[PDB]
Amino acid sequence: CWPQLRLLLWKNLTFRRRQTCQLLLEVAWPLFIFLILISVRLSYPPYEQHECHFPNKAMPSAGTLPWVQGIICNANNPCFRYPTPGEAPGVVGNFNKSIVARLFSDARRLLLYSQKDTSMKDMRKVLRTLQQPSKELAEATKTLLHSLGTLAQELFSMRSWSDMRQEVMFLTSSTQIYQAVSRIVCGHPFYDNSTTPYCNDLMKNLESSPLSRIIWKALKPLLVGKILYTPDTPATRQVMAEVNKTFQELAVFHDLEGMWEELSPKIWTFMENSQEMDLVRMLLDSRDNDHFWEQQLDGLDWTAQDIVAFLAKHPVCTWREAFNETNQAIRTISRFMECVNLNKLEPIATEVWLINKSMELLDERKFWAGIVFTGITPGSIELPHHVKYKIRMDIDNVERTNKIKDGYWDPGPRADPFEDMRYVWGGFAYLQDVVEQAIIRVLTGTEKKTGVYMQQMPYPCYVDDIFLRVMSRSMPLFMTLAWIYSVAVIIKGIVYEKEARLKETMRIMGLDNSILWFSWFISSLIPLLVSAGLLVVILKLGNLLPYSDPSVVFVFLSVFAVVTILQCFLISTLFSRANLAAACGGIIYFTLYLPYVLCVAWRDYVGFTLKIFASLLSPVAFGFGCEYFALFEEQGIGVQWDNNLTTSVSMMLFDTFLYGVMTWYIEAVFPGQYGIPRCMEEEPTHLKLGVSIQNLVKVYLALNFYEGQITSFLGHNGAGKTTTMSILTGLFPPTSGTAYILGKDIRSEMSTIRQNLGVCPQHNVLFDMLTVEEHIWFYARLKGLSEKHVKAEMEQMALDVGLPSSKLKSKTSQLSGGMQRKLSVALAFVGGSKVVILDEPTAGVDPYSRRGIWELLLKYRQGRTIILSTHHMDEADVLGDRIAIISHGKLCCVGSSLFLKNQLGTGYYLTLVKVSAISNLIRKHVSEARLVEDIGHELTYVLPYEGAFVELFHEIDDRLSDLGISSYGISETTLEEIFLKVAWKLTQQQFVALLWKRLLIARRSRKGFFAQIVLPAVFVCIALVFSLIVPPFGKYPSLELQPWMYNEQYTFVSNDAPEDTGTLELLNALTKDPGFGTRCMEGNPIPDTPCQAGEEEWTTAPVPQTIMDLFQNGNWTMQNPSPACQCSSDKIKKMLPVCPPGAGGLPPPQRKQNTADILQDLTGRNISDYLVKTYVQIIAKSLKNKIWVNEFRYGGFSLGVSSQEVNDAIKQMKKHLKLAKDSSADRFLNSLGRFMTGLDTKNNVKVWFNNKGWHAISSFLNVINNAILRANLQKGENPSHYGITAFNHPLNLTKQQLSEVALMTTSVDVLVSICVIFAMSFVPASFVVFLIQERVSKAKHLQFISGVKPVIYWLSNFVWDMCNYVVPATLVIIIFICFQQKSYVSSTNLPVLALLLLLYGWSITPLMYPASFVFKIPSTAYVVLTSVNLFIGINGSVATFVINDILKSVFLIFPHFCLGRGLIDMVKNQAMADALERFGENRFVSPLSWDLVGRNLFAMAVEGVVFFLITVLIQYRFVDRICVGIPPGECFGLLGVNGAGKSSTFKMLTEVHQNMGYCPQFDAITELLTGREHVEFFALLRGVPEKEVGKVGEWAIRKLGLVKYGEKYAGNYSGGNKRKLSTAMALIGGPPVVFLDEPTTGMDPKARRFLWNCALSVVKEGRSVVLTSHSMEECEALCTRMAIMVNGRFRCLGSVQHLKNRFGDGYTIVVRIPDLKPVQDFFGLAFPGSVLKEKHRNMLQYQLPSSLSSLARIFSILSQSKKRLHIEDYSVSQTTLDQVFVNFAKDQ
Ligand SMILES: *[C@@H]1O[C@H](CO)[C@@H](O[C@@H]2O[C@H](CO)[C@@H](O[C@@H]3O[C@H](CO[C@@H]4O[C@H](CO)[C@@H](O)[C@H](O)[C@@H]4O)[C@@H](O)[C@H](O[C@@H]4O[C@H](CO)[C@@H](O)[C@H](O)[C@@H]4O)[C@@H]3O)[C@H](O)[C@H]2NC(C)=O)[C@H](O)[C@H]1NC(C)=O
Ligand SMILES: *[C@@H]1O[C@H](CO)[C@@H](O[C@@H]2O[C@H](CO)[C@@H](O)[C@H](O)[C@H]2NC(C)=O)[C@H](O)[C@H]1NC(C)=O
């Protein structure tokens, strides 16, 4: 067992090594594949991003100044990387260093101090008292000095105007300006015709200035926009008035220019020519007042000297420069605010007019969002207590509403300032909050009393490695490309070893399939294990899977190799071809791997039971293992031994076992075309008996085989010599019989019997890529010989073969057929086998190699029990020693040759070469004589039987010159006798005949290639049902802003400063019966979301044993209240950070709020740290369970705490100081007061929102607005039915968006066109494989012999292909028109597409014609043609994703590209017409336009034309004195030496075409047609009549026989039946001369004689025939004028007997008498030329050369010695033609 496996592995390794054409590519393909993989990996480095927070944004309701400050500077998500103070629950500032807020505070302080100051009245009273020393004068002067000091202090202690002046003088290199603006505004980290061109050029410079152009995108819809609303309902009018007021709150700069123009002269004269200023300047400079000013200044800067220099200046810095600078600043701000539109309110009567006006303003590039209410009627009723409003804006400023989530999860906070922040800079949230606050003010009455802020939740320290995620999850593709190459190669090898009948030869040699399968398993693992190790080390070195142990991936790759090896072992027993299996294995594996990519997309509702029942394949299990590896690798921890993967390995081993048992079942239930599905002479006892059969029988004989005699075994192959030879071997078991093979029964022991019993079947065994020496060594080792024994056997075989040279012993299987047959028959004798069973030797070999192999078998007659089994008669006569013929399953005759010849055989045959005189002489000499056969210059007679021989020969020799007899001959009876005794309009006729034959071969192909009609049909059906799934990608439905759009979410409410000031009732109403928003309140006004009613429990989740360590780790202050969580250590790439438990610190009290969600109280806890820790730990815990983790929390609220005095002060100040009622003084003061009282906020709420949710911030804003509404409602019946709902619905698409969606949709069109191209490329494949099947000498050349006009044949093929493609064309047309695809089923697009498909077929059917010319193999062009068609289609599709003009002009040669471009332009025009009809216009451009579609049609037409012309062109491509005369009825057989060019001469020698018939050596008949139809079609093409066709067919079917099987498939016939069909074809037209070639090839007796009778009958009618073959018996029995050509020239000509007597050898004699040496001595002394050819017991034979003329004396001596030598039997024969042939070939 072990030595056999050793020989098997050695043979497999030698096969793998001797190729040198497959293993190098096998080992190089994975290198290139993974090199491309490592290159595309190294091109994408991993992106690392530290954890960061985001500043809080301010809404317009929380103050105009903070809103503007949040818009301008901090609107880019700077990611400070540290917790900003804005995220603190107490402070809502972050504008502490902003000089604008400081300046506003100092201005407010100046106002509130000047209103309560009385320095003006005090100074006026002091001046009046001084103008009208004293006692009260001192007190008055002291009061005036104190008042002046207070005014000086008020002018000081502000430090804002100085900084503003410094900044405005510095502003009037790129980083410096940005830093200056950032320090000024906030803290530290065609248009010219509309309005004036000043701010137009300003905004142009802003857009062209080199900085972050994001603030302009937010400031454009702020002062250029315009909002429009519903009809003029009084309530809508009131809310619009409130919105206008909250906009104009910032209009204090509009009426400031008039105030400055009115107040400039007054302050000018007050500072120039006022007595108060002079008195102040005089009192500021004195001898005692200086100390007072120094004491009042408190050591501050700008002492009294600087004050006197600044104020007291009649003519370096005085008040004049300050006045000029303030005037310039006011002028600049007025010119800036001039073109600012603050009246952006326009009412509309209806809704369609609203849409039209919004579009019109969109063309004007000035249009903000628009509010659309849902009023029931324009009545005086305020509100229906439920406000439903929508906000319609442009699509480029609002997030898409067709999707609410990114779909696949991916790390990243999603905080881009422009790409995914349209709800901030677009103005959606601002206007939404403004409208909501206006509604709150108009419903209840409260004005604001509320601030709102938005805070984005931070992200916990991720890294961006999406490439690793997409590569490690798509590992099997590039992991198994090279392994698909390997499995294809190994499948090719296996099926090649199987098809050559090598497995059957190994089985009959005494081997089982188990050891063969095991050896193939090992020889397929070894290279697979090597490649697995190489891929493991190249993946460990590639740095793409770090921290991964090589052992686990190595064992995974090895078990995957094992399961794939057993999978291909299962798949191999289904195919029966080398290239076919090698090509279809890859596509079958792809189709069975496609389930993986099919199931990975629908993982949402996949079950574990479904996963188990679907994991029966190896690719899906490998994909599950790769997903496990990815999930354990992405987190940086890697995969190690930690006890999923084990389930995947278990399923893989179960799959291996299932594949093994399936292989074991299929190898037995369905085998190939060769497997098995589950007058007796004296017995010479001089030698030993080797095999003695006894009672041989089967399911519906006894012969004793001898040792030293070469016995024969003849039969009809139907009743014997076929089942008996199989029962004698180990193929089939016996049935009530016995066979003692060398003293061992067959049924008793079968192993020891096969150890010394060789076999040699008809199919020779010769492994390729190997030498004959390796073959001999392997066979000797398999026999069981030792090393020296095998060497001696190989030396003996090399010495006895005849090729003892290194040129032949070290060469591969490149010898001729004769040498191959000789070596294959010599292999069966290696090993010293005592019993050999040959099978059909010398089938079609030349007579020289036949004599060689005969001498070879004769040299091995030293007791080897040679059992011959062949159909040849002369071979069995010369080789067989004991001829045994059986019939009907029983023994009939047995005995030697001469015994069977003289017992029941016919008498002698006397022939004469060149008739009544000779016949009369023969009748007078012998009474029993008769005339047997007389042919051209030849006659023969029979002598059935003895002194008449001498007298007859004397009379023949004496009267030889009397008649025309030129030479005589005598012969004995051959074994075949005993065998048979015992057991013009012709063009149209050819056209219609071709069409009829083609229709018959196509209609009878229901079981054959019939899939070429329904396979493209189902492919196009799948194409359409897949195209009816992708959304139009151009829809935007109306979505209601509500936070419950997601499945599950976690909210929270953080109550800061619980002092019951204004925050208690707010959170209360937030957590009352109505809940968060409008989910359920006296009904469910939200579709498909019924809320749960019964739930009320304030409990804490069960905490594990983690609070103990928190207790022993006490002193957890507000700063750092939880243990740290590390990040991205060196050389450790971690996607999500991990750290020990205790991340949150304490489980907050969880409670459900009856809205399908649960909230937790976070009062007094660090919000940012807790949120980060909880989020990261929950994401990790959810990802650990293989759930495809989604988002966890979306939003939460934090309530906290942050007037009329300033308004009363402004009113009191405006009442005095020259009050008036003009529109330039009172309006400015009123606006200033309103802006002052519109910035204070009592309480505020901060909404923490996650930017991953597309509609999260707006929904929570609406929720908090509804909560504020329910809290502000007082003295109401119930807050249930008081709620506000917000909607989001963009406007209609314009021409730009329509063009965008028409240009972007080309992806679905190209992907639906590629597949339909692939489906339509299947029709010509059947035509090409049909032409290939009938191209290899089957029907092309045979029809080309006779007059066929091959151009007409090509025309017929073309028209049949057209009419056979018409049917599937309209079939698929009605298929894809049955569906409602308006882009194809319209009345103007159906005929153009139909004709496009028609011309595409017309242009593709000739293109695949020349690919069939040079292709010498059938049933394999299908896959390569489909592959090249797919490649051409892919190239043409990708070539349209771009120099484009010349590209599309030159790429029109491929019809696939033309069809793709036509479909693309057709669907593009359909979409364009649809968009233009939707917009309100019409276009009727015809698709038949020569520029668009119609150039491709004419191109395909002319291309098909030129392809047909060039295919007709390719077909046309633009011996030594051979002299012989063939008269009427002269069978002139022209034989020749091996390699004399007989086929070339026959092709060269072939009016003359129609008068000549040809018979091919190989079978030429259709596999699916009928023989009668074959002969009918051939009679039609021959030129017979249309009415006499049936009679000619019946005559042809009755002449050649086989009438019982005349109506049947020709492919299901046998070899002899095919030969009969071919020789009937050779006479279908009835030519005067017909050329035959090997009429009998592997046939059986009782049928060759029939063909010979038909041949002699057709040549007897005066029609000469020409034939040639290797078997000399056929020509010696049929040919009458032989023509032997040695080298190019006819070396011998004449009759058969004349040539055999002229250059042939002498006669042969056989005498039968233990024995006596005296008889042999007398025989040797009587003839001088006597030679002992063979010496046996009581049977001698001799040969007499150069003694043919003395036959009479020889017969006389024989008759005289019959009584002296006591001879029992005598026989005399002549030399046959084979001796003459081998003599002519020997001396050559
Ligand atoms: C909730 O929990 C988070 C953490 O989980 C807390 O955040 C901690 O507290 C501060 C933020 O609120 C952070 O302090 C900052 O730390 C920066 C780090 O710089 C180094 O710090 C180490 C000490 O860790 C020093 O030895 C080094 O020398 C560095 O200074 C400081 O740079 C930063 O200092 C600021 O610098 C800017 C720019 O120069 C100044 O303008 C500013 O005035 C200030 O000086 C500041 O000290 C702290 O790192 C952060 N994390 C930790 C682990 O403590 C929240 O505070 C918690 N919430 C509440 C309400 O407390
Ligand atoms: C809405 O507000 C705008 C300004 O915020 C008002 O327009 C003012 O009044 C007339 C136009 O109506 C102009 O002459 C003024 O220059 C505008 N600006 C100012 C500051 O007065 C408009 O009147 C308001 N409309 C309603 C219905 O209140």
Ligand SMILES: CC(C)CCC[C@@H](C)[C@H]1CC[C@H]2[C@@H]3CC=C4C[C@@H](O)CC[C@]4(C)[C@H]3CC[C@]12C
């Ligand atoms: C209510 C508040 C927030 C609005 C007023 C903010 C003021 C102080 C800011 C906002 C816009 C700023 C102006 C923007 C444009 C220009 C034009 C430039 O050539 C000179 C500076 C100047 C004139 C800036 C001066 C300061 C400015 C007017």
Ligand SMILES: *[C@@H]1O[C@H](CO)[C@@H](O)[C@H](O)[C@H]1NC(C)=O
């Ligand atoms: C600046 O921050 C300090 C911190 O204590 C605070 O007291 C002060 O009011 C802030 N200034 C503002 C908000 O203008």
Ligand SMILES: *[C@@H]1O[C@H](CO)[C@@H](O)[C@H](O)[C@H]1NC(C)=O
């Ligand atoms: C906008 O699109 C809707 C969608 O059907 C349509 O009903 C409406 O008429 C369109 N309006 C305009 C002005 O095109």
